[PDB]
Amino acid sequence: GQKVHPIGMRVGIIRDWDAKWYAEKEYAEFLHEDLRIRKFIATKLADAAVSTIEIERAANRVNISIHTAKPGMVIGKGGSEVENLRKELNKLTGKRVHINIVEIKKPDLDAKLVGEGIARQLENRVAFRRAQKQAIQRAMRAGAKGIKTQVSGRLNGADIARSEGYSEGTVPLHTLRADIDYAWEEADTTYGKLGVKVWIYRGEI
RNA sequence: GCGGGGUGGAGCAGUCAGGUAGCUCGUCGGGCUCAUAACCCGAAGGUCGUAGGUUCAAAUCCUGCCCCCGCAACCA
RNA sequence: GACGGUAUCUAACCAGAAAGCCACGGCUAACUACGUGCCAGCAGCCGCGGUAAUACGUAGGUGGCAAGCGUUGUCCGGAUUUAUUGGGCGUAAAGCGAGCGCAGGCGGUUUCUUAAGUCUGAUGUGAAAGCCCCCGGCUCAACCGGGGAGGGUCAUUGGAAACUGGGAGACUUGAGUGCAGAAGAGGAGAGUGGAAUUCCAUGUGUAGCGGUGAAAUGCGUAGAUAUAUGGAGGAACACCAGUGGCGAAGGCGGCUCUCUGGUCUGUAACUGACGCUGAGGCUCGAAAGCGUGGGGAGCAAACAGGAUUAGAUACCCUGGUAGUCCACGCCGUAAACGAUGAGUGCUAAGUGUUGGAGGGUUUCCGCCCUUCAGUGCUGCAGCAAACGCAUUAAGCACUCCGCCUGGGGAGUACGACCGCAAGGUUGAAACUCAAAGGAAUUGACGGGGGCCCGCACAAGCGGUGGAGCAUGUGGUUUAAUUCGAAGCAACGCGAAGAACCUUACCAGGUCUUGACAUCCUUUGACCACUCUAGAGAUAGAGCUUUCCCUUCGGGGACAAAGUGACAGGUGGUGCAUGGUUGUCGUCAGCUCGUGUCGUGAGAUGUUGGGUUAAGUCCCGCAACGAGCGCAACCCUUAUUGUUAGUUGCCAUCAUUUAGUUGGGCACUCUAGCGAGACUGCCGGUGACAAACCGGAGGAAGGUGGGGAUGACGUCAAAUCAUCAUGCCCCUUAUGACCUGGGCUACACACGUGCUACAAUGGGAAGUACAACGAGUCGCUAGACCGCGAGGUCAUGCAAAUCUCUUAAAGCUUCUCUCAGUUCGGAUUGCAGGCUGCAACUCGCCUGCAUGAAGCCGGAAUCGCUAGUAAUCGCGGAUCAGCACGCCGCGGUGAAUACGUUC
RNA sequence: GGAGGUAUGACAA
Ligand SMILES: [K+]
Ligand SMILES: [K+]
Ligand SMILES: [K+]
Ligand SMILES: [K+]
Ligand SMILES: [K+]
Ligand SMILES: [K+]
Ligand SMILES: [K+]
Ligand SMILES: [K+]
Ligand SMILES: [K+]
Ligand SMILES: [K+]
Ligand SMILES: [K+]
Ligand SMILES: [K+]
Ligand SMILES: [K+]
Ligand SMILES: [K+]
Ligand SMILES: [K+]
Ligand SMILES: [K+]
Ligand SMILES: [K+]
Ligand SMILES: [K+]
Ligand SMILES: [K+]
Ligand SMILES: [K+]
Ligand SMILES: [Mg+2]
Ligand SMILES: [Mg+2]
Ligand SMILES: [Mg+2]
Ligand SMILES: [Mg+2]
Ligand SMILES: [Mg+2]
Ligand SMILES: [Mg+2]
Ligand SMILES: [Mg+2]
Ligand SMILES: [Mg+2]
Ligand SMILES: [Mg+2]
Ligand SMILES: [Mg+2]
Ligand SMILES: [Mg+2]
Ligand SMILES: [Mg+2]
Ligand SMILES: [Mg+2]
Ligand SMILES: [Mg+2]
Ligand SMILES: [Mg+2]
Ligand SMILES: [Mg+2]
Ligand SMILES: [Mg+2]
Ligand SMILES: [Mg+2]
Ligand SMILES: [Mg+2]
Ligand SMILES: [Mg+2]
Ligand SMILES: [Mg+2]
Ligand SMILES: [Mg+2]
Ligand SMILES: [Mg+2]
Ligand SMILES: [Mg+2]
């Protein structure tokens, strides 16, 4: 059957909100500025392994923390690239933006990056079994307590869609204390959308 | 000309022996079934071919007339 | 010298004139694009084609072969698929139903002999050409020539002599005879016994009997059935009785006698291979059937009647003829079965039993051992596709016979033989299919079995189906009644808000780089507002008309224009998809790694014994572990310590109409941090286990109550209108703007609701008790106006402070008095109130008037196991306004569960 | 434990 979102289930139990601000009358305004901020960054930094955006609001300011496995690319030479990002965000948001780059250690354990990686390979006509197996290898070598991956759609151009997935170790989706990262990424192929889902189980909380 | 028949959609009673219009299957509506059949429950469908008489009252008795069916309509 | 100026040779000249055919899904060497969309076509077989075809057609490539390449036809091969080499017959095709036997095939030991078979030597011959072998010739090869070899079940002749055969002997083990015993439903004939059924007669006796799931037909007051005593007649033989016995098989069951077959065991006197098998022939051969003559109790095709049923030419019931029985003569077939031909020998064991034999003990009885022949069970080796067989082989061998060669057409046709007939025996082909089949495996299923669970049923309570109305759906209607959902799992569903908007539909009016983007662009503002026209969109006017900066060259931020790329689709396909969801179901399962078993698919684990809500745990186990689920971690609710004490609270105090003010946070409460339940404690049961039963303490006890949490998968289930997206389609349009209409249309059918049908009530008055929640142009106190909906001035509160919000059921009095009513409140008239630019189509509310059906609801059907159902209100999301819906909240608060057949 | 005997359901997918 259908399963609860692994992150939505643990938000407020062991996982915290990414939108780390409070508001009453500007809640609607702030929320949809965040969506424009998140959408803009996902376009500007599509080439950098940007995983988590945390937004904090202090009066007229907007503090934005960007987690990236390629901090050097995001920053650029002498902060050229991030500085061009604050100006673009300042124009977009209409207020002061501070951008904080955070280094993602162990990107092989970050579901979004792993899912994005598998998605890119499928777009290169890489064997879908191969793409998932080597993602599993990297995650386990990085020390994951377990990893689970799945690809759905018209695999290798098959007329009839099907889902093929692989797992290793433990992925206890019902254990609420388990720190299970999840991501869904889409790979657009010649035949249409392929859905890549990744579950990574790190040290339980 | 000799008989037989006209009553609900069809097939039949009731007609002799006057009082109250039904039975069989079917039709329609609802149930039951995944569905159909079977089954269950409700409803509808004729003032008795048609028009006069007799009577307190007729589908019934009397009379006519129109329809439908089997016979006959000529023998050495 | 016909060939003939032919071969051949030499010189010059030019790459110049000289390649195709088939195949490329697998077999099978060779792959991609278009085109086509179960069409056109391909195809040797399997099979391709249903709008993204390496299989159809074309092209480019590629493969094979090449002056050829392919197709068709024919033969051999592959084909062990007629098996001599070289197969089979328990269940796949295949053992004749069984015996007796002529011919034939085969046949024990041995001496001598022969030598037909067999083996061997020599000679003769097996023409030439041809294949093959050497050797030469043509420039090579083909081709030609020379020399050989090979080829015969050949003849003549000389040898050998084991084996088969012939001849003369000998032998005793096979086979038979004798002698001595053993058992038997073996057969035939003639008698005979009891039990029971039926009929008949006679008493007794009185209204039923009989029968089925339930009934009826039937029998009986003309005396039944039952009961007693008898008589008649037919058929079959209870107990004994037993994978017990006998027989070739079919078969044979009371007892007695007469005639008669066979088998088994000892003995070892006799014969001396006399044997085995056996086409063709002959004999026997269940049951049904046939003929002639008897018999006829019971049973029972047919048949009759009664039922069942949609129909029943059935199953069921009541009857009942042939037949079943006897004699004689036919028939000659059966899942005539061990679905396993006969004879012989050989190849572990264990244990029953029938008939014998021998010995060792036992007083006998019997026990012990050895053995023969049957009959069973279990089980090695071996065999087998497996199932299984296994000294009673399906094992290892030899002999003879029968039979088989894909399924269907066929055991049919024709012919023949046999038969009284019914039919039997023998037995094809055309044509057709690419399968039929055996065993085993995993699932699913069963009107199979066992064990369990769930408001599944049962036990209850209240409903739905009837009425009115609300709402969704079908249908119909319509210019449109937008699209989606359809068994559970569509139908108060997407819609948590259709008057306009929404809106996707329709009519009319309109626009064509566009309502919305990006990119180029240009002598920069654009909007905005104003007026006319217009339903409006829109036009035609007036009027204003932009910033950032750097050095002054400009650029960049934004329009707005221009123009071409492009935009735009709630257009299609949820059978191309991602995501999301329902569903089985919070049911307990679903698997993997390694090992092991199996030829194999698979199996094991995961089953078994317990236990649990649970694949929960324990124990056992050819398994040992692991993962996804279960459980736990999370939320809420029930008790409590501590910290905190306002806006919450008021016990001890004084005060106020007031928890008011002072004062205090003690209690309540709010909220963080903690405490508490863990089978932890105790008794019993249990396999020293898991666990179960009860107990104490405790606010809470065994998951405390509830929630969140939904395994691998299932239904090509839902969604291309949330979004996204492959492919397809539209592009002055299927895009876009506007006003109006529609989505709310109504002869009808269904789903879900609401309100009722009254007195456990209606009406009036008085009085009490919640919780979850919401609030800024919002929630609104208080006062005043209005019958009311509400209006007016005005107040507090961005809020455990103010407000919505004095909850309704409830309780206490009064009234009504069973009435379609003082029940019910549909429908309609009139008059108003709000929100809105506007409520005619289409809003909600109010007053007055009006006062419909409905008297508790057919078949059928739904929810619920307690703070639940039932009933009562309250808040919220969407929302200007608008729900009887949805989500949540508290009040009051039951009935029942024996039990698991359905 | 094992063994011989006593109503209906298009076609493709
Ligand atoms: K082909
Ligand atoms: K052979
Ligand atoms: K036989
Ligand atoms: K010889
Ligand atoms: K005898
Ligand atoms: K006879
Ligand atoms: K024996
Ligand atoms: K054939
Ligand atoms: K409906
Ligand atoms: K889907
Ligand atoms: K295994
Ligand atoms: K506390
Ligand atoms: K699409
Ligand atoms: K879409
Ligand atoms: K309703
Ligand atoms: K209703
Ligand atoms: K009262
Ligand atoms: K309106
Ligand atoms: K009702
Ligand atoms: K509202
Ligand atoms: Mg190939
Ligand atoms: Mg082709
Ligand atoms: Mg051959
Ligand atoms: Mg068979
Ligand atoms: Mg057979
Ligand atoms: Mg007979
Ligand atoms: Mg036969
Ligand atoms: Mg024996
Ligand atoms: Mg019940
Ligand atoms: Mg109703
Ligand atoms: Mg659909
Ligand atoms: Mg509209
Ligand atoms: Mg409109
Ligand atoms: Mg689907
Ligand atoms: Mg299982
Ligand atoms: Mg488990
Ligand atoms: Mg076990
Ligand atoms: Mg759980
Ligand atoms: Mg579908
Ligand atoms: Mg689309
Ligand atoms: Mg509607
Ligand atoms: Mg009444
Ligand atoms: Mg329950
Ligand atoms: Mg309640």
Tab-separated table of C-alpha atoms (C1' of nucleotides) in Angstrom, chain C residues 723-863:
chain	number	residue	atom	x	y	z
C	723	C	C1'	1.319	19.093	-10.302
C	724	A	C1'	4.801	16.834	-13.732
C	725	U	C1'	5.600	14.099	-18.170
C	726	G	C1'	6.660	10.423	-23.259
C	727	C	C1'	3.862	10.233	-27.668
C	728	C	C1'	-0.243	12.202	-30.594
C	729	C	C1'	-3.455	16.434	-31.955
C	730	C	C1'	-5.045	22.127	-32.383
C	731	U	C1'	-2.066	26.898	-33.583
C	732	U	C1'	-6.251	34.028	-36.833
C	733	A	C1'	-7.284	27.783	-33.030
C	734	U	C1'	-9.077	22.803	-29.388
C	735	G	C1'	-5.407	29.383	-27.733
C	736	A	C1'	-7.263	34.370	-25.554
C	737	C	C1'	-11.069	38.639	-23.750
C	738	C	C1'	-16.091	39.820	-22.525
C	739	U	C1'	-21.506	39.965	-21.069
C	740	G	C1'	-25.457	36.556	-20.374
C	741	G	C1'	-26.881	31.478	-19.648
C	742	G	C1'	-25.707	26.626	-17.815
C	743	C	C1'	-23.314	23.259	-14.033
C	744	U	C1'	-29.468	24.243	-9.365
C	745	A	C1'	-32.871	21.727	-16.147
C	746	C	C1'	-37.309	16.876	-14.035
C	747	A	C1'	-42.691	11.897	-16.455
C	748	C	C1'	-38.790	8.964	-13.375
C	749	A	C1'	-34.842	4.988	-10.557
C	750	C	C1'	-30.962	4.481	-6.700
C	751	G	C1'	-27.119	6.056	-2.723
C	752	U	C1'	-26.126	9.173	1.719
C	753	G	C1'	-28.552	12.383	5.030
C	754	C	C1'	-31.949	15.710	7.806
C	755	U	C1'	-36.841	16.329	10.045
C	756	A	C1'	-40.961	13.928	11.565
C	757	C	C1'	-45.070	10.567	12.457
C	758	A	C1'	-45.979	12.831	19.059
C	759	A	C1'	-47.336	13.041	25.755
C	760	U	C1'	-40.436	9.264	27.705
C	761	G	C1'	-44.141	14.607	23.750
C	762	G	C1'	-45.573	19.870	22.157
C	763	G	C1'	-46.034	24.901	24.328
C	764	A	C1'	-44.969	28.654	28.299
C	765	A	C1'	-42.160	30.193	32.582
C	766	G	C1'	-38.096	29.551	35.941
C	767	U	C1'	-33.058	27.367	36.989
C	768	A	C1'	-27.975	24.589	36.262
C	769	C	C1'	-23.626	22.408	34.276
C	770	A	C1'	-18.919	21.931	29.208
C	771	A	C1'	-14.983	21.254	25.902
C	772	C	C1'	-12.396	21.866	21.383
C	773	G	C1'	-11.731	26.193	18.890
C	774	A	C1'	-11.772	31.358	16.197
C	775	G	C1'	-10.801	36.711	16.068
C	776	U	C1'	-8.021	43.440	12.992
C	777	C	C1'	-10.702	46.297	9.754
C	778	G	C1'	-11.754	40.923	12.426
C	779	C	C1'	-14.409	39.012	17.195
C	780	U	C1'	-17.539	42.598	19.314
C	781	A	C1'	-19.285	44.009	25.434
C	782	G	C1'	-22.797	47.561	27.253
C	783	A	C1'	-26.894	50.875	25.993
C	784	C	C1'	-30.766	52.158	22.814
C	785	C	C1'	-34.368	51.121	18.523
C	786	G	C1'	-37.196	46.682	16.123
C	787	C	C1'	-42.398	41.396	17.113
C	788	G	C1'	-37.939	39.366	14.766
C	789	A	C1'	-34.014	38.703	11.246
C	790	G	C1'	-31.159	42.731	12.685
C	791	G	C1'	-29.926	48.217	12.896
C	792	U	C1'	-27.649	52.422	15.574
C	793	C	C1'	-24.144	55.002	18.817
C	794	A	C1'	-20.120	52.766	21.086
C	795	U	C1'	-16.441	49.471	24.140
C	796	G	C1'	-12.542	45.906	24.979
C	797	C	C1'	-9.253	42.726	22.684
C	798	A	C1'	-3.710	40.720	17.829
C	799	A	C1'	-6.193	38.224	23.180
C	800	A	C1'	-5.329	31.166	29.605
C	801	U	C1'	-6.805	39.401	30.302
C	802	C	C1'	-11.607	41.381	25.693
C	803	U	C1'	-15.081	38.973	22.616
C	804	C	C1'	-17.700	35.117	19.816
C	805	U	C1'	-19.771	32.004	24.410
C	806	U	C1'	-25.425	32.682	30.146
C	807	A	C1'	-24.328	25.332	25.338
C	808	A	C1'	-28.512	22.053	24.499
C	809	A	C1'	-30.303	17.898	26.290
C	810	G	C1'	-31.207	18.429	31.937
C	811	C	C1'	-33.978	19.882	36.577
C	812	U	C1'	-38.505	22.466	38.944
C	813	U	C1'	-43.609	24.354	38.195
C	814	C	C1'	-47.990	25.539	34.592
C	815	U	C1'	-50.448	23.986	30.390
C	816	C	C1'	-52.242	20.781	26.410
C	817	U	C1'	-55.137	15.313	26.884
C	818	C	C1'	-54.535	11.234	22.084
C	819	A	C1'	-56.787	14.651	18.236
C	820	G	C1'	-53.610	14.209	11.555
C	821	U	C1'	-53.884	17.238	17.045
C	822	U	C1'	-51.460	23.137	20.474
C	823	C	C1'	-48.212	16.472	16.585
C	824	G	C1'	-45.551	17.450	11.822
C	825	G	C1'	-43.517	21.995	9.176
C	826	A	C1'	-43.490	20.676	3.484
C	827	U	C1'	-45.719	24.186	0.027
C	828	U	C1'	-47.442	28.908	-1.099
C	829	G	C1'	-48.951	34.426	-0.489
C	830	C	C1'	-47.311	38.892	1.624
C	831	A	C1'	-43.882	41.798	4.184
C	832	G	C1'	-38.966	42.372	5.654
C	833	G	C1'	-33.410	41.662	7.061
C	834	C	C1'	-28.487	40.941	5.546
C	835	U	C1'	-23.928	40.161	2.267
C	836	G	C1'	-22.833	41.849	-2.484
C	837	C	C1'	-21.907	46.107	-8.440
C	838	A	C1'	-26.090	42.590	-8.524
C	839	A	C1'	-29.576	37.450	-5.335
C	840	C	C1'	-35.047	36.772	-11.931
C	841	U	C1'	-32.850	32.175	-13.354
C	842	C	C1'	-29.577	30.597	-8.024
C	843	G	C1'	-28.592	32.905	-1.749
C	844	C	C1'	-29.251	32.653	3.656
C	845	C	C1'	-32.252	34.481	7.517
C	846	U	C1'	-36.891	37.012	9.747
C	847	G	C1'	-42.276	38.171	10.771
C	848	C	C1'	-47.412	37.268	9.491
C	849	A	C1'	-50.457	34.114	6.927
C	850	U	C1'	-50.816	29.250	4.656
C	851	G	C1'	-50.556	24.348	7.498
C	852	A	C1'	-48.752	18.976	2.491
C	853	A	C1'	-47.274	13.931	3.235
C	854	G	C1'	-46.511	11.383	7.496
C	855	C	C1'	-50.169	7.064	12.669
C	856	C	C1'	-43.279	4.040	12.836
C	857	G	C1'	-42.497	1.942	7.234
C	858	G	C1'	-42.865	-4.822	1.994
C	859	A	C1'	-38.811	-7.994	0.248
C	860	A	C1'	-34.324	-6.460	1.887
C	861	U	C1'	-30.531	-3.997	4.299
C	862	C	C1'	-26.796	-0.771	7.848
C	863	G	C1'	-23.928	0.836	12.238
